[PDB]
Ligand binder design. Structure first.
Ligand SMILES: [Cl-]
Length: 211
């Protein structure tokens, strides 16, 4: 993991079965959400088949990105990979806990709640936009399940942070309902959160993306 060898990004790449399970949980969520009376009631604030709306799914296995590196050109890439724990974690297996699924007009995603051990692989030099303020590092951690038309998956970061900010300040609101596997919260502005009754555990390998 010297500078010349760095990937486009590092992250946890879900195993094939974990990826399948979470992809399927996400499609069931999008289908059940789009059919729920509370969501249909709020259609104006969002724009319908949410599975298709979020059809942009990059090719390959679902993942939780840590550090965008741009093959060593990105700020802090070399210093991230220089860390012993990164070197020692490359190729190693992890369990990630998913606590919620979410939807915005721009992205559909799974919130990841990293362990202390996994946080050691979370970069310390990320930008700190206003929506991250008061949230501990790693709150951004997610798996993107789908994007709208012309959305860039870097948008998923900011959508999740905005949702977590709203929850943090007590405007989560009362559950509007229950979908399979959790409670459904309406946050306004097209933003929806399925808080899962049980965390979804996925398995993943920490490695580099060289597409
Ligand atoms: Cl964060």
């Amino acid at each position: 993991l010297e500078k010349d060898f760095l990937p486009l990004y590092f992250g946890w790449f879900l195993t094939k079965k974990s990826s399948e399970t979470l992809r399927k949980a996400g499609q069931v969520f999008l289908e059940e959400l789009g059919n729920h009376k509370a969501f249909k009631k709020e259609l104006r604030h969002f724009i319908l088949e949410l599975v298709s709306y979020f059809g942009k799914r990059p090719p390959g296995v679902l993942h939780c990105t840590t550090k965008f590196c741009d093959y060593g050109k990105a700020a802090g890439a070399e210093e991230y990979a220089q860390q012993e724990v990164v070197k020692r974690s490359y190729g190693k297996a992890f369990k990630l806990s998913i606590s919620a699924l979410f939807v915005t007009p721009k992205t559909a995603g799974a919130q990841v709640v990293l362990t202390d051990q996994e946080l050691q692989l979370w970069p310390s030099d990320l930008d700190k936009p206003s929506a991250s303020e008061g949230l501990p590092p790693g709150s951004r951690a997610h798996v993107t399940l789908g994007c709208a038309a012309d959305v860039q998956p870097v948008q998923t970061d900011l959508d999740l942070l905005d949702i977590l900010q709203q929850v943090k300040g007590g405007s989560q609101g009362e559950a509007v309902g229950e979908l399979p596997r959790g409670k459904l919260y309406s946050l306004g502005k097209g933003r929806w959160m399925l808080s899962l009754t049980k965390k979804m555990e996925v398995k993943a390998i920490f490695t580099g993306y060289y597409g």
